[PDB]
Design an enzyme around this catalytic site. Structure first.
Site, PDB file in Angstrom:
ATOM      1  N   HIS A  33       8.680   6.457  17.148  1.00  0.00           N
ATOM      2  CA  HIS A  33       7.381   6.366  16.517  1.00  0.00           C
ATOM      3  C   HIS A  33       6.662   5.213  17.179  1.00  0.00           C
ATOM      4  CE1 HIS A  33       4.310   6.331  13.446  1.00  0.00           C
ATOM      5  NE2 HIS A  33       4.486   5.032  13.298  1.00  0.00           N
ATOM      6  N   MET A  37       0.807  -1.212   0.000  1.00  0.00           N
ATOM      7  CA  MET A  37       0.000   0.000   0.000  1.00  0.00           C
ATOM      8  C   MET A  37       0.837   1.258   0.000  1.00  0.00           C
ATOM      9  SD  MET A  37      -2.741  -1.576  -0.391  1.00  0.00           S
ATOM     10  CE  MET A  37      -3.834  -0.179  -0.555  1.00  0.00           C
TER      11      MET A  37
HETATM   12  C1  LIG Z   1       7.013   4.094  10.554  1.00  0.00           C
HETATM   13  C2  LIG Z   1       5.610   4.491  10.135  1.00  0.00           C
HETATM   14  O1  LIG Z   1       5.218   5.793  10.370  1.00  0.00           O
HETATM   15  C3  LIG Z   1       4.683   3.514   9.490  1.00  0.00           C
HETATM   16  C4  LIG Z   1       5.149   2.220   9.202  1.00  0.00           C
HETATM   17  N1  LIG Z   1       4.389   1.275   8.567  1.00  0.00           N
HETATM   18  C5  LIG Z   1       4.918   0.002   8.275  1.00  0.00           C
HETATM   19  O2  LIG Z   1       5.138  -0.021   6.888  1.00  0.00           O
HETATM   20  C6  LIG Z   1       5.051  -1.376   6.496  1.00  0.00           C
HETATM   21  C7  LIG Z   1       4.307  -1.404   5.153  1.00  0.00           C
HETATM   22  O3  LIG Z   1       2.971  -0.946   5.232  1.00  0.00           O
HETATM   23  P1  LIG Z   1       2.027  -1.161   3.987  1.00  0.00           P
HETATM   24  O4  LIG Z   1       0.685  -0.619   4.339  1.00  0.00           O
HETATM   25  O5  LIG Z   1       2.665  -0.778   2.708  1.00  0.00           O
HETATM   26  O6  LIG Z   1       1.921  -2.778   4.072  1.00  0.00           O
HETATM   27  P2  LIG Z   1       1.618  -3.833   2.900  1.00  0.00           P
HETATM   28  O7  LIG Z   1       1.339  -5.162   3.594  1.00  0.00           O
HETATM   29  O8  LIG Z   1       0.598  -3.361   1.911  1.00  0.00           O
HETATM   30  O9  LIG Z   1       3.026  -3.932   2.124  1.00  0.00           O
HETATM   31  C8  LIG Z   1       4.134  -4.644   2.621  1.00  0.00           C
HETATM   32  C9  LIG Z   1       4.758  -5.375   1.423  1.00  0.00           C
HETATM   33  O10 LIG Z   1       5.995  -5.921   1.813  1.00  0.00           O
HETATM   34  C10 LIG Z   1       6.157  -7.076   0.986  1.00  0.00           C
HETATM   35  N2  LIG Z   1       7.284  -7.872   1.435  1.00  0.00           N
HETATM   36  C11 LIG Z   1       7.354  -8.841   2.416  1.00  0.00           C
HETATM   37  N3  LIG Z   1       8.634  -9.278   2.483  1.00  0.00           N
HETATM   38  C12 LIG Z   1       9.374  -8.607   1.555  1.00  0.00           C
HETATM   39  C13 LIG Z   1      10.712  -8.650   1.175  1.00  0.00           C
HETATM   40  N4  LIG Z   1      11.578  -9.515   1.720  1.00  0.00           N
HETATM   41  N5  LIG Z   1      11.157  -7.818   0.166  1.00  0.00           N
HETATM   42  C14 LIG Z   1      10.281  -6.955  -0.448  1.00  0.00           C
HETATM   43  N6  LIG Z   1       8.959  -6.926  -0.097  1.00  0.00           N
HETATM   44  C15 LIG Z   1       8.524  -7.739   0.894  1.00  0.00           C
HETATM   45  C16 LIG Z   1       4.794  -7.751   1.041  1.00  0.00           C
HETATM   46  O11 LIG Z   1       4.634  -8.758   0.054  1.00  0.00           O
HETATM   47  C17 LIG Z   1       3.894  -6.524   0.870  1.00  0.00           C
HETATM   48  O12 LIG Z   1       3.543  -6.308  -0.481  1.00  0.00           O
HETATM   49  C18 LIG Z   1       4.461  -2.110   7.714  1.00  0.00           C
HETATM   50  O13 LIG Z   1       5.524  -2.681   8.517  1.00  0.00           O
HETATM   51  C19 LIG Z   1       3.863  -1.024   8.539  1.00  0.00           C
HETATM   52  O14 LIG Z   1       3.713  -1.295   9.909  1.00  0.00           O
HETATM   53  C20 LIG Z   1       3.201   1.748   8.227  1.00  0.00           C
HETATM   54  C21 LIG Z   1       2.584   2.964   8.433  1.00  0.00           C
HETATM   55  C22 LIG Z   1       3.372   3.898   9.114  1.00  0.00           C
END
Ligand SMILES: CC(=O)C1=CN([C@@H]2O[C@H](COP(=O)(O)OP(=O)(O)OC[C@H]3O[C@@H](n4cnc5c(N)ncnc54)[C@H](O)[C@@H]3O)[C@@H](O)[C@H]2O)C=CC1
Ligand SMILES: CC(=O)C1=CN([C@@H]2O[C@H](COP(=O)(O)OP(=O)(O)OC[C@H]3O[C@@H](n4cnc5c(N)ncnc54)[C@H](O)[C@@H]3O)[C@@H](O)[C@H]2O)C=CC1
Ligand SMILES: CC(=O)C1=CN([C@@H]2O[C@H](COP(=O)(O)OP(=O)(O)OC[C@H]3O[C@@H](n4cnc5c(N)ncnc54)[C@H](O)[C@@H]3O)[C@@H](O)[C@H]2O)C=CC1
Ligand SMILES: CC(=O)C1=CN([C@@H]2O[C@H](COP(=O)(O)OP(=O)(O)OC[C@H]3O[C@@H](n4cnc5c(N)ncnc54)[C@H](O)[C@@H]3O)[C@@H](O)[C@H]2O)C=CC1
EC number: 1.1.1.27
Lengths: 315, 315, 315, 315
Positions: D181, D13
């Site tokens: 954070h 996302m």
């Molecule tokens: C620090 C901060 O203010 C925030 C941090 N986050 C963190 O940001 C991360 C990503 O959030 P998002 O909403 O983008 O999550 P998602 O599940 O849509 O995307 C994560 C992607 O990572 C991929 N992924 C997993 N392992 C991977 C790897 N080894 N290499 C590349 N991509 C990988 C997985 O397939 C998914 O598409 C999560 O850890 C959240 O907690 C989110 C919001 C705010």
């Protein structure tokens, strides 16, 4: 059309840059009005072509006819003298163009009242804190619909000079200069921040000294003179400051910007215009913010107002 | 730093607007170089304050020292005469400043070769198609690293005038003017489109007539003279056109923009610079596009080149 | 306030990106309306914080109440099914959601007619050329005040793919896809230009071949399916295309953009919506441009319209 | 080419919105990398078309190959879990994904060290203050070349909520949230300004009360949970905050932005990452700014660091 109509009353150096920036920002249709024959049409023609490079669609036309103020949404007044014909560049100040620039404000005021009484007015003609009030009185517009340029420009200098010393983004320095635009401008050391942090913290860390700041303060007050002594004239930053103000109005941004506005008791002052932070949005001056000055700062504010009154009397 | 360093060789009217636009667009650090003492420092100071209003962080400094070309990534040359001292505004043309502007190109060329041989060069000094080649020869830079202003500016006028008649966004009109910048500029009716549609369709629909277009063509060729006769001077649109070119290079946009470039057989011409569409990106002139002109269009192109050669001989 | 009020009727994937882009561009206040409880409030909250990063001042609020359409200046309808619940990703097409999406258009139409009959409406729900007409009929808005998404999106793909092959700036490729959005979209080879130059010139020079173009044509038609087969969904480019349309209206840009509009004899067609270039400004659809198609192109246009009629009958 | 190469390690996302914004801002070529097959190619394809609408020229490609990190100028890591598979939305916190997200940071770190050891790294994976340090250790990059997201996002919420109450432009509110954070984030009331003016002045004037501010503080800390409870997920503002950071680096803006960085004695802390204002420019973290906290504020900072250490131990 619903595009804003922006009439630049005065098509000189500042007017030209303002027209350029309005097209760059696609802010509205522009009229370059001036008393000089033909010149505004020429500048307008040149500037109009930039719509192509800018991906914009703003008309830019010239005018030698006061009645073209009709329908104006914003009127920006730079019309007037810029220096006393006879005085050297070394001795650039304020006593005898007053009656001549007063006549210009009176004339423009009558035309605003007849043709665009609901327009938002920005006054630039110097001495601005005097001229803005004169235009307010003769145009008849509400107090929330007319302001003078000053603080946005003066603080841009202070902010910029500090940002260079500290090696931070210029916009990340915030600062307040109040009272009047001119040599009595009140620079408020206490109200300077860097990335939102009090400047004093940076002084404590020896990143910038009090002596450095004193020099930057004097440089800020004297910047117009510095530029003139370098064989140039300040018009680019004045134009950008004015457009920042106009854009806040047009787009309802509600930016806090320091401008000359009618004081109604703030700082102990009434019946005069002076520089203070205001909020500019769709309703014009939406808020007048009164800084909680200490007695020493207020004394300097009083000196600024006194100078505006002195010149208003001679106008 | 990795910010681009952009040296404006010439800090006059066009130079000032270019500096303003570079800061607005945060394109890089700027040096306003000129032979006039102090003036570039004054313009630079004024312009530097706009970083605050623009949310940018570009240094703007003045220079009276050729060696400040060192490290330049882009050099824009507007240095020179703008009119023959003695000739009226009515009779504004090209015979005797040639040797003087040639000397200026030669001098600047030597300084480029010594200090910034890898810079991307844009030449503006008139007659541009002559001066660009002279600068190419004396600077020693590769052919893909130097271009002249012309077509972006000339077509902006044609595009704009047609857009006004048709009531469409100016950028939605596309058009080609080739060969040379000046009175022999070749306006290609066949290559005009509106929203990507051939202009002929709009003529067929009586939305714009052939006679209207003829008048717009003459207006385009004579626009500089029109502006001068209105007591103004063309410098805002020239500046915007130049910045569009420079930005395409700096940002690797690969825009198709008509500029003066070394011809190597295109249109039957070699060993001369002439206006043609090119693609500007990180590698400079990445492509030279040759329009598939018919014999009538080519005849006009030949007339333009002949005039460039005639003046080159007198320089 | 005078800021535009933009109501996104549908707060799904496209709605979210549209809200993001509106704040980036400071285009107006945004309402994310949906039938799903709470979700639009959550997306609105997230998106609202971006005003800080963007230097904007647009409200972003969620709504589960149709009456929040009141006061809307622009309404963008993405509400509906995106795929038939039961059909694989391989077989993504158009027969049986028709009556369900028709009911959604009817419902939204009634609410528009009651609450914001003077709004400018953009319809996105598929099949768009059918749904836009249904919404036109039930909302009662004038023909110049409602359009459907199609050509801006479909041509963005064609333009982009050609730009990659030719190594030019994507916007420098112009192209026309007309008739309908969907598998019967009519790609007009004859109307493709590169920097305003006919594509045929580039084919003649062997820079791109006819066979390459055929493959790019098929890729363009099948792009939605290509993205779905890659385990993604097309929503970012659709959102950007819609915002380009909305921005042209809001800012009176008068861009030429291909959209679905009521045909009143153009191409031999009446009483139906189909894709054609239009000019979008303050008055909505200010001009409907009829391409002077040849008989072969017109035959393809007819096939597109026939398919819209076929599905309209089933709705 | 000299365009920056920006590799998004994680194409979920946040990754999707980041790619969208990079193209809008023409910041550089983008690689959407993920472990999910095909999906990043689909998102990349969709996003690439927006170059047309945006007037940009950024490549957007998908990747399922770690080696595509080669040549990266900026790497943004969002890879990981976003919630514990088994825990409700009500109980969204931090104990057992730690070892799994640690393994992900370790893996990515090895690939960075091999393929792009000179890249600037932004870490987003939660808990970010822990994960950033882990990535720092395994990637081997210098301390000035890796930061964690936190304060830009958390303060955007505080700034926004206050701006709404006070009816000013969101960017005109400045505020500091430090330490970490997460639920132990330290909100510094003393360091809040409005148009550069201390917030206390607005409290004194009864424009906003201390009780209102307390509620806004709690709302800020709990915003992620608020959005989740509304059936949405925070990803748009996180993306914009990250892009603001990345843009400051790429453009050498030298913005003061609060990020997670290695502490080397500031606040009495070493050998740990924590949130503090830093200056981001071409040299990465050019300055680490230490707020001159009082003992009460420092006590809260200590609590934040203690929580980071507690989770680091479990990872
Ligand atoms: C620090 C901060 O203010 C925030 C941090 N986050 C963190 O940001 C991360 C990503 O959030 P998002 O909403 O983008 O999550 P998602 O599940 O849509 O995307 C994560 C992607 O990572 C991929 N992924 C997993 N392992 C991977 C790897 N080894 N290499 C590349 N991509 C990988 C997985 O397939 C998914 O598409 C999560 O850890 C959240 O907690 C989110 C919001 C705010
Ligand atoms: C408040 C402030 O921060 C500053 C104020 N100024 C004032 O702004 C004014 C304009 O400066 P600019 O550099 O634009 O001067 P200019 O001489 O190039 O342009 C003034 C134009 O006014 C025209 N003019 C004179 N009377 C007019 C009238 N009645 N109506 C319209 N135009 C008129 C005149 O022909 C010239 O083109 C002068 O009063 C400056 O002192 C300048 C810089 C900063
Ligand atoms: C190709 C084209 O579309 C156009 C070309 N021009 C040419 O552009 C040139 C600059 O026009 P501008 O309006 O800027 O003229 P200006 O007189 O205000 O500025 C020229 C500056 O050059 C300086 N200059 C002279 N010799 C120099 C040198 N050796 N090095 C640096 N600067 C020098 C001189 O002092 C003045 O400030 C003239 O040759 C114009 O004919 C103008 C408009 C359009
Ligand atoms: C014309 C064109 O080029 C394209 C059209 N579409 C159509 O656009 C529509 C929306 O696509 P999106 O990807 O946004 O779908 P989504 O499922 O994420 O969002 C649709 C939202 O509509 C809501 N919805 C359903 N009924 C509604 C109603 N009565 N009022 C408001 N929202 C409603 C529903 O809850 C969901 O959030 C679909 O019909 C697509 O086929 C998509 C891509 C391109």
């Amino acid at each position: 059309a619903p595009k804003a109509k922006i009439v630049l009353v005065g098509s000189g150096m500042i007017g030209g840059v303002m027209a350029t920036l309005i097209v760059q920002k696609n802010l509205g249709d522009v009229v370059l009005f001036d008393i000089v024959k033909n010149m505004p049409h020429g500048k307008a023609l040149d500037t109009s072509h930039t719509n192509v490079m800018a991906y914009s669609n703003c008309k830019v036309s010239g005018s030698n006819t006061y009645d073209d103020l009709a329908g104006a949404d914003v009127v920006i007044v730079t019309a007037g003298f810029t220096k006393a014909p006879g005085k050297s560049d070394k001795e650039w100040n304020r006593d005898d163009l007053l009656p001549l620039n007063n006549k210009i404000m009176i004339e423009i005021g009558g035309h605003i009242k007849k043709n665009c009484p609901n327009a938002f007015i920005i006054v630039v003609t110097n001495p601005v804190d005097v001229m803005v009030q004169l235009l307010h009185q003769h145009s008849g517009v509400p107090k929330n619909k007319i302001i003078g340029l000053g603080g946005v420009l003066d603080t841009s200098r202070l902010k910029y000079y500090i940002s260079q010393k500290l090696n931070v983004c210029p916009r990340d320095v915030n600062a307040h200069i109040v009272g009047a635009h001119g040599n009595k401008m009140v620079l408020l050391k206490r109200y300077i921040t860097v990335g939102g942090i009090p400047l004093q913290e940076f002084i404590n860390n020896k990143l910038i000294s009090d002596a450095e700041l004193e020099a930057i303060f004097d440089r800020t007050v004297n910047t117009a003179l510095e530029i003139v002594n370098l064989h140039a004239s300040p018009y680019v930053a004045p134009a950008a400051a004015i457009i920042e103000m106009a854009e806040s109005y047009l787009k309802d941004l509600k930016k806090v910007l320091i401008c000359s506005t009618l004081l109604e008791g703030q700082y102990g002052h009434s019946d005069i215009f002076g520089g203070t932070p205001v909020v500019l949005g769709a309703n014009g001056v939406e808020q007048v913010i009164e800084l909680q000055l200490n007695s020493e700062e207020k004394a300097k504010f009083d000196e600024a107002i006194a100078e505006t009154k002195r010149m208003k009397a001679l106008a």
